[PDB]
């Protein structure tokens, strides 16, 4: 019993976290109205896994988490659990028993630029895969070859991070798309957040 949730503080933010540094959020002790989500036409990716959106406001939850990042169109498909790809195996992946679901829409009028925009970058080279819901920050030089190289990069010693090059004149599947993924723990604790009753 309170006023409202900061839903517009995430979906309408100006700066969005990169792929390799996705940030959580503590949405709790608020009142959530999911009707306002249906406002942007290009919700071409609103497919929801744990619960059906139509019956989305008659029950409520224990705790929610709102991740967010910016990817390219081609990999929008590989956010669903169990996929394989260069971004779902080294940067971000979801558990097998995932609950909650994903919202994506195109944004090629804000996060893009005529000169370009080298502010979003991922990690392509890594020692191995990563466990679900895990972050990494280290920028140590990858050692591909069997030779001791420290600090200095080049052949057999690469820089793990590579940058996107977004430009307005690209095509669908190469433009930047924003992604927000939730997470619901359904009825295992006292209720915390829901709307009208």
């Amino acid at each position, epitope marked *: 019993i309170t006023n409202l949730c900061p839903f517009d503080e995430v979906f309408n933010a100006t700066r969005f976290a990169s792929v390799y540094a996705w940030n959580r959020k503590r949405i709790s002790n608020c009142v959530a109205d999911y009707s306002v989500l249906y406002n942007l*036409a290009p919700f071409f990716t609103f497919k929801c896994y744990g619960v059906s959106p139509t019956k989305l406001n008659d029950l409520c939850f224990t705790n929610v988490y709102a991740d967010s990042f910016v990817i390219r169109g081609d990999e929008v498909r590989q956010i669903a659990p169990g996929q394989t790809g260069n971004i779902a195996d080294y940067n971000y992946k979801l558990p097998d028993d995932f609950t909650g679901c994903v919202i994506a829409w195109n944004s*090629n*009028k804000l996060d893009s*630029k*005529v*000169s*370009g925009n080298y502010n979003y970058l991922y990690r392509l080279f890594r020692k191995s895969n990563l466990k679900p819901f895990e972050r990494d920050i280290s920028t140590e030089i990858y050692q591909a070859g069997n030779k001791p190289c420290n600090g200095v990069a080049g052949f057999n010693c690469y820089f793990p991070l590579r940058s996107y090059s977004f*430009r*307005p*004149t*690209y*095509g*669908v*599947g190469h433009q930047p798309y924003r992604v927000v993924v939730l997470s619901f723990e359904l009825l295992h604790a006292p209720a915390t957040v829901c709307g009208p009753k």
Partner: antibody
Amino acid sequence: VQLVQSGAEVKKPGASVKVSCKASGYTFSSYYIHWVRQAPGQGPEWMAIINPGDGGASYAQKFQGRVTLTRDTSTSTLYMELSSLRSEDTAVYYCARAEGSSWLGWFDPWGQGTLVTV
Amino acid sequence: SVLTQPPSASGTPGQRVTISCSGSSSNIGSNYVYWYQQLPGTAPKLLIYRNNQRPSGVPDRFSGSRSGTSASLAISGLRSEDEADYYCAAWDDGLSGSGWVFGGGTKLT
């Protein structure tokens, strides 16, 4: 408050040409510039986008690589160097004007045009 | 697409004739639609902004709108000075390339 073009003539096939139009009036570093070329018997076409200063440009598909684009601040000129000319590319060159710091919008007044034929 | 346009449109003085560009989704459905007017022996000029009221100044006789995947411009009060050609402009957001696909060519009498 207006844009002025240059003059040009016929160029031999399989060569390179230089297109430039001097600008005077509004601020130079706060307004995007569009390039369009118009061929007789049909409509015009879009060429590339310009961002004065840092000379960042973006090109379309069917005209990537073949087009070189340059800008500066002190001289206040736009350099448009086409390469590998063919007889199909006989058209007038128009340097346009845009909303300002936004590639999407209407068109401010165009130039008088420059014609090159192959 | 290519923004198919009627090849020509004739008329008589005092008669109201309407020209309309034909498009598809992601080109007329999503983004704005413009209208540019070109006179012979001159340079291309803009006629309208976003499909709405007149840009800066013109008789209110020039107006138009957009429905579904097409847009229309209504022209009345035909003069011999208004004999010209008109073009449509809109964003594309197509597959493998997205620029400023214009229209074709129309003849006015």
